[PDB]
Write a protein that binds this ligand. Sequence first.
Ligand code: ATP
Ligand code: ATP
Ligand code: CLR
Ligand code: MG
Ligand code: MG
Length: 1104
Amino acid sequence: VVSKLFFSWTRPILRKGYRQRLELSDIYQIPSVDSADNLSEKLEREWDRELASKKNPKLINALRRCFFWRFMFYGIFLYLGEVTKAVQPLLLGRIIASYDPDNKEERSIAIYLGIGLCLLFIVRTLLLHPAIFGLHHIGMQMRIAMFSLIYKKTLKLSSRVLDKISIGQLVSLLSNNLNKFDEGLALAHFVWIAPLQVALLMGLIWELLQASAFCGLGFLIVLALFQAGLGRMMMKYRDQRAGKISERLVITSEMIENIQSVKAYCWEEAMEKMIENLRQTELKLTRKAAYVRYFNSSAFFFSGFFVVFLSVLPYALIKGIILRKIFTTISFCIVLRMAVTRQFPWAVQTWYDSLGAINKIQDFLQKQEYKTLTTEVVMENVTAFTPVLKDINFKIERGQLLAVAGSTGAGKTSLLMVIMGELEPSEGKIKHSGRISFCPQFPWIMPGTIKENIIFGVSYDEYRYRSVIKACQLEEDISKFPEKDNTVLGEGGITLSGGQRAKISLARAVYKDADLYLLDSPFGYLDVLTEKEIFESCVCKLMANKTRILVTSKMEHLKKADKILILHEGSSYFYGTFSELQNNTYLRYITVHKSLIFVLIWCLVIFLAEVAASLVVLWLLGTSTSSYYVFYIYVGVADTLLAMGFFRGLPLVHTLITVSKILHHKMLHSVLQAPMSTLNTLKAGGILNRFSKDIAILDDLLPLTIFDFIQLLLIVIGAIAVVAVLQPYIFVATVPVIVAFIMLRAYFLQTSQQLKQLESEGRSPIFTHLVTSLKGLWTLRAFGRQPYFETLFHKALNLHTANWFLYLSTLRWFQMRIEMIFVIFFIAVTFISILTVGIILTLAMNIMSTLQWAVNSSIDVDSLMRSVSRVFKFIDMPTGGQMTVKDLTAKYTEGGNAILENISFSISPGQRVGLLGRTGSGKSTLLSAFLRLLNTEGEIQIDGVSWDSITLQQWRKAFGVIPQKVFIFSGTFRKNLDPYEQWSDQEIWKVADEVGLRSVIEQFPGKLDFVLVDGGCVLSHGHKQLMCLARSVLSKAKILLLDQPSAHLDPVTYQIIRRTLKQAFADCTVILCEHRIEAMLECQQFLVIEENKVRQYDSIQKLL
Ligand SMILES: Nc1ncnc2c1ncn2[C@@H]1O[C@H](COP(=O)(O)OP(=O)(O)OP(=O)(O)O)[C@@H](O)[C@H]1O
Ligand SMILES: Nc1ncnc2c1ncn2[C@@H]1O[C@H](COP(=O)(O)OP(=O)(O)OP(=O)(O)O)[C@@H](O)[C@H]1O
Ligand SMILES: CC(C)CCC[C@@H](C)[C@H]1CC[C@H]2[C@@H]3CC=C4C[C@@H](O)CC[C@]4(C)[C@H]3CC[C@]12C
Ligand SMILES: [Mg+2]
Ligand SMILES: [Mg+2]
């Protein structure tokens, strides 16, 4: 009961982190009270009751019904601590008054008042920090519960709504409340405490001064109204900035998720300039908001002297004054100014932010839902949404395969979604058993082992798993990795090839036992032989007992299919059978800008001039009462004489934002120029979290926190120096305090930094799991694995929250053991109970009263400095047509498996050198090694210029790339086709022609103006391939490395690729990696990547 009160349970973790490293096991396990599952259960029950019983559902009521009693129980103790703070200066002024021979009504009562002031100090100690920690815990619990509720709603979110809300919206939504909602609950409870403290202090100052407390309160109220107006005007500057932040975040997320494609296209300058275009707009509002918040937070320091002036003039002008009763006024007014200028506007701002976040989150939870209501799949007169489908109708019995064929953009995938239940048929009905197994057209590989990616959250079945992995031809690929079957794949499956990803997705679809199977072209990225073997082993032999609908464009599959449905423009052209058809961090933060140092020098010079002026004025100015109170007045009013005005704080804020600008620009340039192996080393959710938080902190929190720390440090230094020049014993007495302060701060910093880094790197899993949940929500709701993904999210939330709560508990231990212990049990007990010299060491109390605040600001600065440390650690990253290659070894890592081992060949100019090889052989590896994206070796001399005779970008400029991973970023069709805008709309409309996008672009509301959100989800997969083809055509170059251009096209649309090959690339060399026999027939030279070694053939007949 006392261990929790004193937070002595953090002793073991602090002791371990003092001399060791907190890797994974010494982080304490989460308690059961704040477990994410339990918190989500309680909040979900309350929210469901609220929207079932009330008329206008409000999340604030649901949160109140479960947290209000604890909130108020901590708030009353917080108010008691504030009351002990506001009653302290009465005792202080009645104690330090007994320092002169004047013994008026004070005889032998200082010894009876010091022991009371000590008790008040210790009761403030025991009553403030536990309440603050309780409020922090309540905030963390509320954040956990709301995050889990949001994740459940996202799992249940409709498909139509997802067409507009993207990853950036969600990541910006959880970026703020993850580290502000918790810390605001210890500051939003001053809304009724600050008025009460103001009332109490007004009563006391009316007791002291007759009728000047109200006169001072008038100016204080005017300043508080101005502060509230500034806060309201500042909320607007963040509302208009959140959208820009989200857009930049999603743009850079798509950029880094396809950094291979960016490097292949040489889109480093283009995408850098694109991101800075949004960065400038965001930073304009960031700078405006930072100026406004500087003026809002500097109204405390530049108000003390004016408040004292206005509260003394109407009394001292007619009734006299003495230093005792002006110092009591100053002591009361310091607390009054803090309460009404630093505590009430802060509380109002925090309440506004919390209510806005709660309302936005409730709006998110109040979006459209996703409704679903012998497996004889019937479908009659179904129309989908111009209509994507039109009068599509079919009937399938149990154990009867049906094949859906048609042109690109016909609506085969759309029909599959209408079958599953995602798309809403405006007219018609769908009748089938609920169980559905889906193999998406673009395979989705979630982070985790291959076993997890295949089983997908069901009971492990040895025989079924072996049969699936043997039928899908995946055993050969599986028995090559260091882990035989349980090998961990990165997010998005970037370690595997396209064919391996397709095989894994098809295996996952097959493994699940469902009545209906929707194989959305599972043989798109697979070559002819593997596709044939999989079709007659995993679609016609294993699952030859249950109905399955698969999209195909091969006459063999159509002949096998018992029913054929051909779609053209969304209309069922034919529906029958085939037979029927046949008829250093600080040192580098400051020095990264050549103007931050100048601003700091200016501030230091002005501060020194102000200190000299104060010292000479005090020397000129300085009986018995006035012989020692003058320094007390100066050190109680120093917060105004040594405050930064608009001449030394506004430039500091501006430079501290420009530092964030240059840091982000350098970090983005380093990301673009980082080696591909190191980019593979990191993740994508981690990159998104870094660009979301470690730049937002630098933009908003860090400049203002550094301003506050410098303000407090300057005030402390000036108050020390001016008084110590006159009275050196002040600085003599302050040393034994500051040494312990610095000692404890250092003793806790080397563990707080580790905990902060652990929290920062434990934040990435939540974002990287939500990213995959949103990317594969389609298959998630097809498979019904929402409970499994909810359990995964809860595990990730617990993993992050245990670490974060441990860090906050350690920080609270430090901020208690310094503030309310290392002052209250040393200074306020041995500097007041020495009543014998009591003037030259009692002012140490008053100086330390703000030195502890300076130390708090410094420790907050160092806590925030971890973001800059991470940003800098990222910044430190390193950086005719003939071809002749020799001794080329393409390894993805220095110590991995050499994919190619001494491959050598020659390519004549104007020769289409097609490339063959089974899936997983290394064809894409060879194409990437041509651009030396990976490590690579040897020389790729082209007409004379070798690898080392030309810089990397100039080398890559002479290549045309069509990657298997189609890269489309957010932006218009014009931007997608040419970020550099080298060719105008007239010169790109022709490229849209002769490629098949004339009938596709014009369908959208804006011709070359539609914003392709969600990674080009609006287009189909064939249209994505055609867009990449058109982009390659626009990027007029030679020695094109075509990497499966017609990956999912059909022979009707493959003629587009064919005539583009024979027209646009009239005289050049093509290295096309197409798996289509029709496209391979026209090639003049062939390379077969077998046994990890290429060959040199000359004709198809010599090939076979
Ligand atoms: N980034 C990577 N890091 C490590 N290994 C990789 C990486 N990318 C691919 N591999 C592996 O190295 C080998 C090279 O395959 P590659 O990616 O070149 O595909 P591929 O044979 O061209 O594919 P397909 O014909 O199916 O399109 C494969 O075994 C693949 O799983
Ligand atoms: N999310 C979406 N919002 C609006 N229109 C969409 C969306 N997804 C697809 N479409 C459009 O619906 C039509 C049908 O596309 P669909 O993906 O069903 O084609 P498909 O037959 O699967 O094509 P492919 O041969 O490329 O696989 C196209 O005109 C496409 O642009
Ligand atoms: C926490 C707050 C709301 C409690 C109520 C306000 C208090 C602080 C105010 C209201 C009335 C005030 C009192 C009004 C009159 C007197 C008589 C005078 O000879 C001594 C001070 C004294 C006793 C004042 C002290 C402060 C006082 C008690
Ligand atoms: Mg499709
Ligand atoms: Mg490939």
